[model samples]
Target chain A: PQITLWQRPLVTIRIGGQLKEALLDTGADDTVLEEMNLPGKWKPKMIGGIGGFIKVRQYDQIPVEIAGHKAIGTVLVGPTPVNIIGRNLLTQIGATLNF
Target chain B: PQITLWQRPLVTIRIGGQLKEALLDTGADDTVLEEMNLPGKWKPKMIGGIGGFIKVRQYDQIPVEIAGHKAIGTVLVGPTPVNIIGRNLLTQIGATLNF
Candidate 1:
């Protein structure tokens, strides 16, 4: 499956045993979600973006289903405009950005 | 053309009459570059992201070249970790995010 830039490239993702909306960010290095209640242990972490940096909860080895594709990696939760699927998750789905 | 996410999806872009490296970021809405010497008038603008908000120089209708594709739109210059090609420019090239 593919996503076009006509919009923000929002996609449905399955994580934490829940369905959620996420963005495919080829520009980002890690996957990040806004405040969400996830089951399991997490560590405090920091992630920087365009404007500034903020502390987040890092969950590792989390099984994430992106656009129906399977992926298992670290998922960071914090205050964000939307859930971001960065290069880490992109690699797992063999996602690519191009014309 | 297709670009693989095996790497950072960085590409050579031309702006301000200079060639530079930039990343294709579908997660972002606007294009942002580090520091650049661009001609014409600009306005001080504030854009927010993952961490915090930062003030940047907004230059409108700037011509940008991505690989061989062309894009002319508002380009922002500021203190960025890297050059990001957001949805604004990404739309010009009919770019898409896919697996």
Candidate 2:
């Protein structure tokens, strides 16, 4: 059997003029963003699902510029999502995981 | 300190009309797909990294339908992408991780 390896792009999020490097993973199932770095007001809400409801806070959408690509979306104020990009987003852009 | 619990969606990949469950993680840094179940002409290739070139292979995009949503992307013929979806798709949607 042959060993198979794959690689993807790394992303950097610019918030309040600060740049933070992150990974772009398609296999991740949810959004995981930084929290302690927020510089504005964050609205707290309850997330409900199979495990029950959990309270979480979120910030306004910020510009995520990476690999020469820029996008705007809400910044999640929490520890981090699953630490990987899940199918939710991959299915949107019609993207593929590069190897 | 307060307890923080997070939950995310689990995804299933249907390849060649077979359903395979995949965990979506974010802390992961790369992509990891499957190998044994791959059907068709899979072109083998190598993945290069700081550690050097790691061998790999890939197949064309199959129908990746999931969670009342669907999208198409090439099946990265490897392990699973870092076991999570890094920031690639998360940053694009401007979504936040719930905890």
Candidate 3:
């Protein structure tokens, strides 16, 4: 799929047996998800925000189906109103930036 | 150019007669520059981060040359450690996301 930046690149993803919408974010280093429950062991991490830094739960080896593409990687759970798929998972899905 | 997500997609940009490095971020809605001053009038605007929002000055019609591609659009100037080239300017430069 080829996406234009004219609008937010929100795509449907299947995770935790649920369908959710997430933004494909090149700015984000790690994938962050909103309120959700997952079965796994996670470590705590502090990451940067625009104003201040925030802590998030980092879960590894999570399988996610993004827009019919599959990738198993790390996922972060945090206090976010939006979900963003970062470079980590984007690389596994073979996504790229083209100009 | 086709860029893989193996590393951070930082690119050189020419703006305000100076050269700087910026991240080509599809997650960002507007282009944001750090610790830079621009000529002319600007309006105060606020945008979101992960946990908080910050105040920024929005400058319109700012010309930027991104990786040899010329574009003029809105630029947000504020306190940031890094610069980000957002969708607004990325669209003008004919950037897209491909998978």
Candidate 4:
């Protein structure tokens, strides 16, 4: 089997009154969002890392559609001025990568 | 082989004066950055769609470290109130996807 990355082209998201495109990455672990575009209703908490096991806080979940795909999950809120698409959504959608 | 969605847990990104974690997804196409998270130095040009022609713009490339992996690519700027991880970086880094 030929391993590949990216079964689709772009995933669309609505934020700040606009729809954005994001590439899906299967190598990532959690669902993330850019801190700058966070809606007023979304408030991300400070959470710990894989090894840092003592930090857990309330986070925000946004409504997003990935090229006709939809997922409802909490986007760990933090400073990621850049927008991203993570594995959480891909896994939920039953997508596979070959590369 | 157990087709896995994520080989790693989180990829890190910097935005809004803070670092954040993002899950990687291999099912998407381009690298994306939230319009709101874009740095002042970044000015993305509007590009045409998969079917639309005659649209091209200069975009900004950001330095990102995915877990232990890193990629340097232009982030397509648009409104994505949340963050995402896409396949561009995954293919660049030579990662495999098993579903």
Q: Of the candidates shown, which would achieve the greatest lDDT relative to the real structure?
A: 3
Predicted model with the maximum TM-score: 3
Query: How do all models score by TM-score?
Result: 0.87, 0.38, 0.91, 0.40
Model 1 pairs whose backbones collide: A52-B51, A52-B52
Give the candidates in order of lDDT, highest first: 3, 1, 4, 2
Model 3 Cα lDDT, one tens digit per residue, A1-99: 999999999998988888899999888888899868988899988776656577888999999999999899899988766899999998988999988
Query: How would the docking of model 4 be graded?
Result: incorrect
lDDT of 2 by residue, A1-99 (tens): 111123334444454556665554433443445555766678886544334455657666554443334555455556443222334332333333321
Fill in the DockQ of model 1. Answer: 0.64
lDDT per residue for candidate 3 within B1-99, as digits (tens), equals 788888888999999888999999999888999868799899988876655587889999999999998999999999766899999999998899988
Model 3: TM-score, first chain: 0.91
lDDT (Cα, tens digit) per residue for candidate 1, span B1-99: 788886787888999678899888787888999889999899988877556587889999999988898889899999877899889999998887777
lDDT per residue for candidate 1 within A1-99, as digits (tens), equals 767887888889988678888888887788998888888899999777565577899988888998888989899989876788889989998887768
Give me the runs in candidate 2 sitting further than 4 Å from their true place: A1-9, A45-56, A81-95, B1-99
Using alpha carbons, what is the TM-score of model 2? 0.38
* Candidate ordering by TM-score (highest first): 3, 1, 4, 2
Q: Tell me the DockQ of each model, to 2 decimals.
A: 0.64, 0.06, 0.64, 0.20
In the predicted model 3, the residue pairs found to clash are: none
**Residues A1-99, candidate 4, lDDT per residue (tens digit)?**
234563544455664465666555554455555544455464435533323332222255565666555666555645443345666666665566543
Model 3 CA deviation exceeding 4 Å by range: A48-54, B48-53
Angstrom error of the Cα, residue B43, model 4: value is 32
